[PDB]
């Protein structure tokens, strides 16, 4: 939104860059931060941990009723069966979308998100606009912002992650996918379908 008091994006970026490099130089001198530590953290979340991991969990649940039961009973333990878990996903609770219920997740207080299965959150999830409105007008938000119309008769359950429990949505399996392989089904699972702002890809 327009703010006549705000500097340009260029000036803001220039100021932040200088402040960060300054802080970085100090933490480096103190011996608590190194260039390799920075590169390793970046490498993990740019190439190793991402929504493709959550997609693996989703497709296993879609094709294995027993695993699905274990997943809904204890998300952390179930995901561990696939070697998935860790930082900011120590406690996971998966919620299943059905014909009568639709789930959507948010961290109204900051930006909490299940990193082990979805990687780092997109910027909109962390911003005030989505966070403020989803707990108050979820139906209108889903339709207006994501083009996803949820029938007024269908209940919308908004999960606000106020604790370390991380909520993840298990989207419904799209129709016309009978007998598909786990690999084929994975192409339909999006990061958005696991947040609840969109259903899994149709067709």
């Amino acid at each position: 939104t327009e703010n006549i008091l705000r500097k340009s994006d260029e000036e803001i970026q220039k100021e932040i860059t200088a402040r960060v490099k300054a802080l970085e130089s100090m933490l480096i001198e103190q011996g608590i931060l190194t260039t390799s530590m920075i590169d390793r953290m970046a490498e993990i979340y740019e190439n190793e941990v991402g929504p493709h991991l959550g997609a693996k969990v989703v497709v296993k649940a879609w094709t294995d009723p027993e695993f699905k039961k274990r997943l809904l009973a204890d998300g952390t333990e179930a995901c561990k069966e696939l070697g998935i878990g860790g930082l900011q996903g120590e406690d996971m609770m998966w919620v299943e979308n059905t014909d009568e219920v639709h789930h959507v997740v948010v961290c109204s207080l900051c930006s909490c998100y299940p990193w082990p299965v979805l990687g780092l959150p997109p910027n909109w999830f962390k911003e005030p606009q989505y966070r403020s409105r989803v707990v108050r007008e979820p139906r209108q938000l889903l339709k207006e912002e994501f083009g996803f119309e949820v029938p007024p008769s269908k209940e919308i359950k908004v999960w606000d992650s106020s604790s370390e429990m991380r909520f993840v949505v298990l989207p419904q399996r799209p129709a016309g996918t009978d007998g598909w392989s786990e690999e084929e089904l994975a192409t339909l699972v999006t990061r958005e379908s696991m947040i609840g702002v969109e259903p899994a890809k149709a067709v």
């Binding site: 960060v20 970085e24 390799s36 780092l120 908004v158």
Partner: protein, 228 residues
């Protein structure tokens, strides 16, 4: 605290800014800001709850419009000054130095295998907040409870939109680090955690969706029994 950061339910923030796609890190400074999290944590600048509190104390106008990772930088500086690990004056001097010489080198330093080990361990092993307590849970599934109307000036996970509201206990998750003590430097003091369901009508009055509910996690002290 009753900070502006507690945006759930706030009106007038505008439409969602959502690009079709975006990189994990939009600039090099973001990678640095991100990596400073495990670095400052290991160094004892703060724990997770304290980390959040530092951000909550930001200038609201700055918080609402600044790039996300800048919030992280603010909390590092906040705790660095608090613990005396960061000298503000030296930081300001160095900031001007890099403003004038953006390509100037970083300090010479040795790489440390222990820091990489910490990163791998924290990322793949996690930093579990679950704890064991001696007291049994006070509440159970089905219990109708009311959220506290307390308004602590320090850190807490008491969103203004749920205070004084009545809901139903959905699940008991066991005990976890208590934010009200942890975020204020008072220790873990673990408390039982519960997911509580609040109808949209209860939260927003008539303006709420007639067929929607919000699930919110409440530590034991946050709720009191209405009906068993």
């Amino acid at each position: 605290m009753n900070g502006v950061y507690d945006v759930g339910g706030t009106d007038g923030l505008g439409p969602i800014n959502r690009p079709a796609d975006e990189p994990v890190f939009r600039a090099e400074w973001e990678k640095v800001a991100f990596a400073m999290f495990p670095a400052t944590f290991r160094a004892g600048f703060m724990g997770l709850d304290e980390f959040r509190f530092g951000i909550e104390q930001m200038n609201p106008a700055e918080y609402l419009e600044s790039p996300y990772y800048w919030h992280w930088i603010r909390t590092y500086i906040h705790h660095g000054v608090r613990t005396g690990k960061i000298d503000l004056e030296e930081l300001e001097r160095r900031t001007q130095y890099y403003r004038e010489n953006p390509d100037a080198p970083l300090p010479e330093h040795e790489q440390k295998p222990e820091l990489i080990e910490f990163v791998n361990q924290a990322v793949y092993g996690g930093l579990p907040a679950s704890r064991e307590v001696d007291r049994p849970p006070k509440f159970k599934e089905g219990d109708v409870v009311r959220f506290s109307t307390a308004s602590p000036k320090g850190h807490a996970r008491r969103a203004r939109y749920v205070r004084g509201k009545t809901g139903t206990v959905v699940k008991h998750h066991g005990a976890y680090i208590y934010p009200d003590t942890a975020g204020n430097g008072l220790g873990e003091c673990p408390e039982h955690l519960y997911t509580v369901r609040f109808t949209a009508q209860e939260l927003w009055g008539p303006e709420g969706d007639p067929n929607s509910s919000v699930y919110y996690d409440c530590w034991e002290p946050y709720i009191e029994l209405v009906d068993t």
